[PDB]
Design a protein around this ligand. Structure first.
Ligand code: CDL
Ligand code: CDL
Ligand code: MQ9
Ligand code: MQ9
Ligand code: 9YF
Ligand code: HEM
Ligand code: HEM
Ligand code: HEM
Ligand code: HEM
Ligand code: HV0
Ligand code: HV0
Lengths: 524, 166, 161, 524
């Protein structure tokens, strides 16, 4: 479209920033898409939530149902619960959309956690990027609380119990402020008339806006501080080796977006999540047996379950037990964003870093991370006590005490094992550096001796033994077939062979192109 | 350069742009050096059938959404079982169509777009001293020229006023 | 603050030919290298697939809002009619009595009371509503709902001259 | 803060984009702040709306008031009206905040209209900036509809009448689609149960988001396509003459922001706007006399009032009167964004332009704009028929016919007068270019002749008459005192004089600096 392109060029003349953005190089490691997963989940959340806002009515006034769902006719409920039932049963395709919304929220949280694990273990938070780590931590906290406020909207029995217990009766117990916070937030005592509209406003407008601003800032910082990379053949602290945006990277990103949307649609159509009609409207007098929150608050619930009853009563006052949960939660949320500064104070290393570390080269940090993950898993499993004790025949008090003791003895055990495992991996790497790659072939050496036919990775000395290499922070091959050793199948389709000339030509050109890629990337 | 930048072929222009940006693309290679073979036709046909499936089941999604019994019919007299399949069908058509499109795209990128390697010339670290000195001089002169440093009363009254308003 | 004047050196217009030629070469090579131009079947199947997906998705997105204005939902004495043709003055069982009740503005028992022809002089006007004595006064919740739905109907009010 | 600044510089090294943005030059004309006014109004709107969302409940369920406002106790109302009453009477400082919100909306609309008038009359929409004109037009439409949806939220009698009439019964009358649109939007017939929540979602989330994106794009385009300027001494099509951002421009912008916030606070505290309690809750059976929407929809109302009753009845169908209002409003909204292309097709001028035009140099466009403004004023005054006929004793039918005829005879009269006025101004400029500036002094010239002592603006010939200058698109002085002719008052304070040395020194240095500024800007 020559005329339109030229007229855009005389009116705006970008032609240089477009060239500067079309030539940007991005590294290609499978581990660098765990943030794209969360970004795409957030986009899907935005779209489905904008759809949902056209049918939801966030009031707490009481009505009688008089709808299509018969086992609930004549029951008195709030207006939000009725609006959610109307979305579920009386809009063509509404149940599908809210199920997609909930599944996308779950995938958002899970992808954020996996991305954080990557960032922590590879060491991508060092000198140039502590602030980007901090922004990520804030994003994590906001996502947690946004999901909570979200699933507490269509007030039914489970959401009501969660709200009541956690919000009302942990805010009510804080030492001095306490009830003042409770009355500022609820407008009075727990079941009010302004709670659900306030949560609705917080959930559709404020927190999404803050999250959008922080995500923009995060991606800008990642764009202008170029990406990190793993050590390798042609990689230095001064260059980025990968593919340009122009033909390839946008294509791969868009295809990944479409595949994630496909997975979300499939599992939002085939699996059922939050069937609010099986529950009832919230009433302060009735309860059920499974009262768990979504899996990103289960650690908070488990911590409240397995913490012993230690209260303090002094003059005319009372400090209850959930205060402990409050300070522990706050301590976790404060220890997460302040980790890079702690590590740089303790190790005393303040240099710029653009090459990542393999998790096996840093045993102490890997052990710390494994200990934290074990602690989190214990806290999460201690939240499904009832389900575990019912399905697997175990006592309930037994599960409580198992959690209460594991909380102390599992983290150090995991630390010890992880340290020893990292050093074992290092030794296994050094052995294949010193000798060659084991091929698995045995010989008998006419004077009855068995050898195993190693294969060298570099030069050899006078008597056939390879000269040992030096470690360079890059992974080493361990299987002979990963190196081209046994390959080149036929060149048919699946049941009929091709000609021999075609097979020879294709094999030979493929070999040539492989060798040229190798020789080109070495030499730079 | 010159005005004689024309009469220059495509690859010299591309390498010139790359060197202007600091990018140095090494090892660009087509995927099918030999001409038409049966392997190329097979790969093209395989890439195409996925997109055909995606389009077919997008159409199936449209038809299902338009003509399927969707209203709540649950009871124990007329066991519907047609209403219990209304949301699974929406999901099964929608997700599978878009998944097929994504898989076709990935295959096309893996088997037809040429393979490449590039290098980017980070240029990290502190700025060149030129820019640091110039910008710090600009900031310092904008501050000292206002003479606000030797005006104590104005500054302190301004501070107290803004603080009280806030 | 000191007084100043400055000059900025716009540099407007088209780009230098260097950048135009380089960026157009980059775009053209990225397009010709994929060989997509001589692959007709892939391109056309891709187009039809994306078009079908987009159409189905948009139809499913905008399909929950659409309602038929002419489906018979209102029960009357000749079957069921559309909403836009019933009024609340429409008889329901072929010969029911519908009074011309007037509003009193109070909620002890009557928000609506019947009327007699002598309750008006030769220069008066009054608003009236359909009564249907089976609605009763506003004591119970059922009759209160019936009455509050009578009071809010956009075709109910009538002027009596 | 040397340590912190340097560590920011080794982590980010901007140091060159900051210098590139601290040296940007902006022209200084009083007319270039009419967009800042609208921007600051929008910011205040955002803040006050975020405050308001914490107390509003958008439901349409019925309740009995039972509040503090006594003349409404026992009245049955919706939940939105009760929430608005609770904001007004039971939150400390809520009435003040919603009054600020409404006044800021009004100022937003007025500032947008004045800015559009400037852009149109100075010709700042030519070749490089048609798209920026288009974005501005879209912003105007969105602002209109956003304000409408906003003041229709606390459903009282007036807002209900406005909704009913305009929205319901103009959407209901469209030729073929019509009732389908009505039922898709309201969920059924007019008074529904999903209208107010849907308007709430549209008003706090969607339209503000679209407006924010469009404002960002607008300001980006203005930043990267540098500002225009008026012709003058040292101004060319290739440079920008003004002040740098660094000390001055940010200071002036911030001070203007504070002054606008001050004006809005004052008039939101001292003047009353939308007293919803004097009205009642909306009920379809009662009405009042004013009616009237806010002043940016009054033209739509007036057009509906003064358009004659022309309907068409053919086979089994009906085309009512408000269809005419629909097509005329669409035609206006389509003719606004497509004006630059019309003018470039009609005049045949396709060149780049960076210097503005004085409205007196383009008589035809100025006449067109004056005609459009006269049409708008007629339509707006035809909307307050009742108020005008009541306060000023005029018949009502008389005002209807006055509007109906003015709609045809006022625009052309205004066109004619504006054309002649522009040419008169041009001639007045040419006269002071040919001769000098009239001083107003009379002499008697001993043979009884009266002359008037002109004052030349340039060189003079042999016999004392000035040689005529050439017009250069810049304004010319007309009063002798605007040139330094009678100046230099005393240098006291107000009641006590200073020393003579101080007076002489200050006068003399001031004169020197003035002369140096002049001589410097000429020579470049
Ligand atoms: C909000 C919600 C948004 C959703 C999230 C998605 C957005 C995230 C951004 C991801 C990709 C960013 C893309 C990008 O940056 O390209 C900018 C790119 C600038 O390129 P550049 O010249 O290399 O950068 C400037 C300096 O050279 C830079 O040189 P440097 O290496 O010395 O870097 C110094 C850097 C150092 O400072 C930093 O690193 C911190 C940056 C954080 C800023 C806060 O300071 C900066 O330059 C910062 C630039 C800030 C601009 C972009 C930020 C916008 C997002 C902010 C979100 C809210 C916060 O602008 C372009 O021109 C892109 C091309 C598109 C234009 C096409 C026009 C077509 C005609 C229009 C038709 C009209 C209709
Ligand atoms: C919301 C708005 C946007 C949020 C983003 C927050 C800004 C990120 C920058 C953080 C940062 O790296 O600065 C400290 C850091 C201190 O400099 P350093 O010499 O490298 O640190 C060595 C010493 O340990 C000196 O470092 P340090 O011991 O004082 O730092 C310990 C750490 C203490 O860790 C914390 O407690 C984080 C605060 C969150 C607690 C509450 C969480 C739940 C809410 O402090 C911070 O994390 C700074 C964050 C400030 C509050 C963020 C919330 O500065 C930097 O490394 C980068 C320079 C700052 C970039 C511009 C940021 C704009 C100014 C902020 C407004
Ligand atoms: C209604 C109800 C039933 C469900 C509604 C739910 C809702 C979430 C619908 C989702 C629709 C959503 C837009 C699906 C995405 C479709 C995809 C992206 C089609 C393109 C995939 C592929 C075949 C084309 C190649 C993509 C490339 C070439 C261009 C597009 C492209 C995209 C799309 C990027 O996101 C991107 C991000 C970062 C860098 C670059 C790109 C990029 O180039
Ligand atoms: C921190 C957290 C994790 C702890 C946990 C706490 C808790 C447990 C979790 C959450 C719980 C809840 C209770 C939290 C409550 C959060 C709540 C919702 C806070 C809301 C946030 C806040 C109050 C919102 C209101 C404030 C906000 C809306 C105002 C910001 C202003 C906006 C965004 C800016 C818009 C305008 C912008 C686009 C333009 C900027 C100006 C531009 C750049 C310069 C202007 C300009 C330009 C650009 C020209 O080119 C120009 C050219 C020629 C002449 C003049 C100009 C000119 O003036
Ligand atoms: C996109 C277009 C395709 C949409 C098709 C969706 C299928 C829907 C369908 O087939 O339903 C029938 C619909 O008949 C039809 O042929 C609809 C054809 C379209 C007619 C006119 C198009 C509508 C208007 C809005 C035109 C807009 C485009 C013009 C541009 C104007 C500018 C726009 C700003 C009516 O049965 P109904 O009983 O009312 O629908 C149930 C509910 O009752 C029940 O409340 C339930 O909640 C509903 O979900 C539904 O189940
Ligand atoms: C909504 C939450 C988040 C989103 C959308 C997000 C997204 C991203 C993306 C797209 C990247 C660049 C691509 C990549 O590294 O794969 C990135 C990098 C990064 N993220 Fe996150 N992330 C989130 C949360 C976090 C958390 C919890 C942390 C801790 C964190 C710290 C970082 C750091 C330090 C980088 C830089 C990595 C590098 O430059 O190699 N982010 N993030
Ligand atoms: C950004 C992160 C978000 C998360 C983690 C999240 C999470 C959730 C979850 C889990 C639900 C429960 C849905 C159900 O059980 O049916 C929900 C409900 C809801 N969400 Fe979100 N959401 C997010 C963003 C948004 C946004 C941006 C909007 C609107 C613009 C939105 C609108 C809604 C509405 C209206 C509901 C209630 C409707 C219903 O429950 O059926 N959400 N949210
Ligand atoms: C951007 C342009 C906006 C315009 C032109 C506008 C206009 C209006 C107007 C005129 C009212 C009537 C207020 C009254 O009569 O008491 C209103 C109500 C309201 N506005 Fe806005 N508004 C805008 C933005 C916003 C934003 C961004 C928010 C929230 C983030 C917001 C929140 C509200 C709320 C909650 C109400 C109802 C509360 C009440 O009526 O007292 N508005 N709007
Ligand atoms: C919310 C709506 C709007 C905002 C916030 C806004 C703001 C601004 C600002 C701040 C400027 C630069 C400073 C100035 O020119 O005084 C500007 C310039 C401009 N505006 Fe608007 N404006 C709005 C609506 C419009 C409309 C309705 C039109 C038509 C329009 C067209 C333009 C054009 C063409 C310019 C460039 C003028 C120049 O470069 O000299 N804008 N606008
Ligand atoms: C669904 O079924 C069930 C059944 C049983 N449980 N048991 C629990 C614990 C849950 C559950 O959902 N937990 C998630 C959770 C936990 C805590 C909060 N708080 C925010 C408010 C509060 C607070 C305290 C102090 C503050 O002070 C300061 F202002 F920050 F300084 C501020 C806020 C802190 C805790 C919110 C959500 C659950 C669910
Ligand atoms: C406050 O008290 C009072 C008392 C008396 N009055 N009298 C009037 C006229 C008002 C009043 O508020 N006027 C402002 C106004 C006017 C028209 C609309 N429409 C929106 C919907 C409509 C429409 C039509 C066709 C469509 O078709 C297609 F979708 F475009 F294709 C779409 C939308 C178009 C115009 C919206 C606001 C008023 C107020």
């Amino acid at each position: 479209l020559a005329r339109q392109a030229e007229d855009i060029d005389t009116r705006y003349h970008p032609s240089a920033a477009l060239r500067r953005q079309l030539n940007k190089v991005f590294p290609t490691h499978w581990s660098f898409l765990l943030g794209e997963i969360a970004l795409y989940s957030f986009v899907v959340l935005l779209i489905t939530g904008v759809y949902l806002t056209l049918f939801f009515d966030p009031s707490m006034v009481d009505v009688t149902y008089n709808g299509v769902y018969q086992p609930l006719r004549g029951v008195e409920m709030s207006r939000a619960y009725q609006s959610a039932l109307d979305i579920s049963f009386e809009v063509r395709g509404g149940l599908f959309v809210r199920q997609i919304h909930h599944w996308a929220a779950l995938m958002f949280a899970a992808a954020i956690m996996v991305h954080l694990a990557r960032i922590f273990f590879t060491g991508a938070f060092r000198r140039p990027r502590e602030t980007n780590w901090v922004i990520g931590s804030l994003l994590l906290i906001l996502a947690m609380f946004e999901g909570y406020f979200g699933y507490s909207l269509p007030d039914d029995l489970l959401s009501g119990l969660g709200l009541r217990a956690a919000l009302s009766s942990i805010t009510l117990g804080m030492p001095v402020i306490g009830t003042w916070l409770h009355w500022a937030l609820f407008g009075g005592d727990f079941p009010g008339t302004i709670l659900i509209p306030r949560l609705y406003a917080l959930h559709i407008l404020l927190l999404p806006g803050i999250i959008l601003a922080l995500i923009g800032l995060h991606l800008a910082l990642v764009w202008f501080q170029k990406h990190t990379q793993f050590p390798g053949p042609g990689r230095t602290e001064h260059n980025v080796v990968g593919v340009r945006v122009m033909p390839v990277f946008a294509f791969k990103s868009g295809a990944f977006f479409a595949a994630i949307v496909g997975v979300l649609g499939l599992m939002g159509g085939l699996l059922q999540i939050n069937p609010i009609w099986n529950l009832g409207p919230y009433k302060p007098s009735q309860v059920s047996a499974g009262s768990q929150p979504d899996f990103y608050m289960m650690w908070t619930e488990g911590l409240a379950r397995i913490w012993p009853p230690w209260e303090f009563y002094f003059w005319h006052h009372t400090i209850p037990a959930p205060v402990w949960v409050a300070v522990i939660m706050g301590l976790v949320f404060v220890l997460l964003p302040a980790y890079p500064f702690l590590e740089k104070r303790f190790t005393g290393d303040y240099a710029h870093h653009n090459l990542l570390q393999r998790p096996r080269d840093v045993p102490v940090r890997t052990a710390i991370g494994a200990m934290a993950i074990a602690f989190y898993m214990v806290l999460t499993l201690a939240a499904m006590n009832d389900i575990i004790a019912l399905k697997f025949h175990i006592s309930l008090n037994a599960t409580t005490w198992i959690g209460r003791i594991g909380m102390v003895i599992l983290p150090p055990f995991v630390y010890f094992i992880t340290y020893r495992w990292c050093i074992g991996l290092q030794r296994s790497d050094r052995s294949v550096l010193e000798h060659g790659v084991e091929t698995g072939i045995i010989k008998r050496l006419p004077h009855g001796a068995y050898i195993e036919l190693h294969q060298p990775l570099g030069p050899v000395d006078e008597h056939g033994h390879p000269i040992p290499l030096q470690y360079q922070g890059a992974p080493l091959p361990k299987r002979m077939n990963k190196l081209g050793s046994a390959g080149s199948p036929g060149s048919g389709s699946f049941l009929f062979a091709d000609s021999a000339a075609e097979d020879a030509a294709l094999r030979e050109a493929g070999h040539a192109a492989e060798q040229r890629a190798l020789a080109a990337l070495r030499e730079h | 350069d010159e005005a004689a930048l024309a009469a220059m072929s495509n690859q010299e222009l591309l390498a010139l742009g790359g060197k202007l940006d600091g990018v140095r693309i090494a090892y660009k290679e087509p995927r099918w050096p030999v001409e038409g073979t049966k392997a190329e036709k097979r790969a093209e046909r395989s890439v195409a059938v996925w997109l055909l499936l995606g389009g077919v089941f997008g159409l199936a999604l449209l038809l299902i959404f338009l003509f399927w019994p969707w209203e709540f019919k649950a009871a124990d007299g007329e066991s519907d079982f047609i209403y219990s399949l209304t949301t699974p069908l929406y999901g099964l058509t929608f997700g599978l169509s878009i998944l097929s499109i994504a898989i076709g795209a990935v295959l096309y990128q893996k088997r037809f777009i040429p393979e490449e390697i590039s290098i980017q010339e980070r240029h990290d670290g502190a700025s060149r001293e030129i820019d640091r000195k110039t910008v710090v001089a600009n900031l310092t002169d904008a501050f000292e020229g206002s003479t606000i440093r030797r005006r104590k009363l104005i500054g302190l009254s301004f501070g107290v006023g803004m603080g009280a308003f806030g | 603050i000191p007084e100043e004047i400055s000059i900025q050196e716009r540099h407007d217009g088209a780009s230098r030919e260097i950048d135009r030629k380089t960026v157009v070469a980059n775009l053209t090579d990225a397009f010709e290298g994929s060989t997509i131009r001589r692959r007709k079947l892939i391109g056309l199947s891709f187009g039809v697939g994306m078009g079908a997906f987009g159409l189905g998705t948009l139809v499913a997105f905008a399909g929950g809002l659409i309602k038929n204005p002419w489906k018979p939902v209102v029960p009357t004495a000749e079957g069921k009619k559309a909403v836009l043709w019933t009024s609340g003055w429409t008889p329901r069982y072929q010969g029911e009595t519908i009074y011309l009740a007037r509003a009193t503005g109070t909620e002890d028992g009557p928000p609506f009371i019947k009327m007699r022809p002598e309750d008006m002089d030769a220069g008066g006007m009054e608003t009236v509503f359909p009564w249907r004595e089976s609605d009763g006064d506003g004591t119970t919740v059922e009759s209160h709902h019936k009455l509050q739905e009578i009071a809010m109907g956009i075709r109910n009010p009538v002027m009596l001259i």
